[PDB]
């Protein structure tokens, strides 16, 4: 895109201040209209762009997210009632407990039983 | 006993945007002990090129598998993977001022709002019916029999309350509180809960009177980006920029299909069937080819959805 200096310079006949600022602000939008229509057709069928904006794929990622998240909740709710952060404070003094707790969380995220956690002891 | 907490992995720089998950998955699926693939946000400065992490079972070795993919290409570009080593410094430090009476109380106020927003936004659980927001709000109370008497620096109570919110925010929503950042893709990435930021050691000096207010103004100003909704433009500007009407552009599909070969003889190229007038071809497309009329509406909404967003992807 060409800046305000350049567009005014290419109109040396009907040279008004009121008309110049209107036509440049119209040109701005006239150009940015083109860029969006170019960009849409440029990245039309790409999965990242499809997923963010296309109704069918937008619905899928929400369902995929909710299901993966609900499983991450179950882990927190398991760590609560198991009490993996029963005596745990987010402090550098209690750093080794956090790292062990996170590893215990990841195992539950994958879906391992209490027998799987025994290696951390 | 299984070591499921450990998982070794590959890393790939400069993956193309036309490449999807599906076809990276199929490339790595026929290896043994394959788990999952995770791609990052495509950055505009590199022409929207992604960064991938293929994660494996920790038993099966990575260095041979990285070599077996070392000079392989997908779609229209060459991958050249590298071995992604494990995370070094997990439990990181921040300011020691955060272990304070007034500051923890505000951290609990913020953490409540974060969960209130994120729960509603993600569509888990109009007051929030999450148990840790009800059950914790019951606590943080003085309870005394003052009526019966009338007639006759750390605060670990609040910190132990804060930890339950912060650990929920970190574990459930992948939100590192003390760093003030999300890990959005994290659940697919090799390490499911890597970096976590934690309260500092001590505050050496006397805790300054305005410095507690200054910390919160810096801290809350950084948290405000994390709560922000997708910035939709004004319904003028969306229409000006070029919002397509659904019913209008559906009419454009029907008429442009309904071609004329002669006098009272109309064909459409969505079947190969000729009719006696322009009215007969309209009822043919609506009734028999209901799949296409939705397909137009969907791709109109697809283009609209892009225009709706103010903070879009574009070339710098």
Numbering used by the authors:
A (entry chain A): 149 to 269
B (entry chain C): 413 to 537, 550 to 576, 599 to 762
What did the authors write?
ARS2 is a direct interaction partner of CBC and together they form a platform for the assembly of co-transcriptional complexes that determine the fate of diverse RNA Pol II transcripts. Our structural analysis shows that ARS2 is made up of two regions, residues 147–270 and 408–763 that co-fold into a structured core with an intervening glutamate-rich region of unknown function that is likely unstructured. The human ARS2 core has an unusual structure comprising a largely helical ‘body’ from which project N- and C-terminal ‘legs’. We find that the RRM domain is required to bind RNA, whereas a basic patch in the C-terminal leg of ARS2 mediates the interaction with FLASH.
Here, we describe the crystal structure of the folded core of human ARS2 corresponding to residues 147–270 and 408–763, which are separated by a large unstructured region. We set out to determine the crystal structure of human ARS2 and first worked with the construct ARS2147–763, thus excluding the N- and C-terminal tails predicted to be unstructured. Since crystals of ARS2147–763 only diffracted to around 20 Å resolution, and disorder predictions suggested the presence of an additional central, low-complexity region, limited proteolysis was used to delineate the structured domains. Better crystals (space group P3121), diffracting to 3.7 Å resolution, were obtained by co-expression of two defined fragments denoted as ARS2147–270+408–763 in E. coli. The structure of ARS2147–270+408–763 was solved using selenomethionine-labelled protein and the single-isomorphous replacement with anomalous-scattering (SIRAS) method. The crystallised core, ARS2147–270+408–763, which lacks the central disordered region, retained identical ssRNA binding, whereas for ARS2147–270+494–763, missing the RRM domain as well, no significant RNA binding was detected with concentrations up to 50 µM ARS2 protein. In all crystal structures of hARS2 (except that with loop B deleted), only the first part of the loop is observed with 570-AEEEELL forming helix α10 (‘EEEE helix’). Remarkably, all crystal forms containing loop B, irrespective of space-group, exhibit the same intermolecular crystal contact, in which the acidic ‘EEEE helix’ and the preceding short β-strand pack into the positively charged cradle formed by the RRM β-sheet and the C-terminal extension of the RRM. To accommodate the same intermolecular contact in different crystal-packing environments, some angular flexibility of the loop B structure is required. Crystals of ARS2147–270+408–763Δ568–598 (Δloop B) diffracted to 3.37 Å resolution (space group C2221) and exhibited an ordered loop A. A composite model, including both loop A (from the ARS2147–270+408–763Δ568–598 structure) and most of loop B (from the ARS2147–270+408–763 structure) was artificially constructed and used for illustrative purposes since it is almost complete, only lacking residues 578–598.
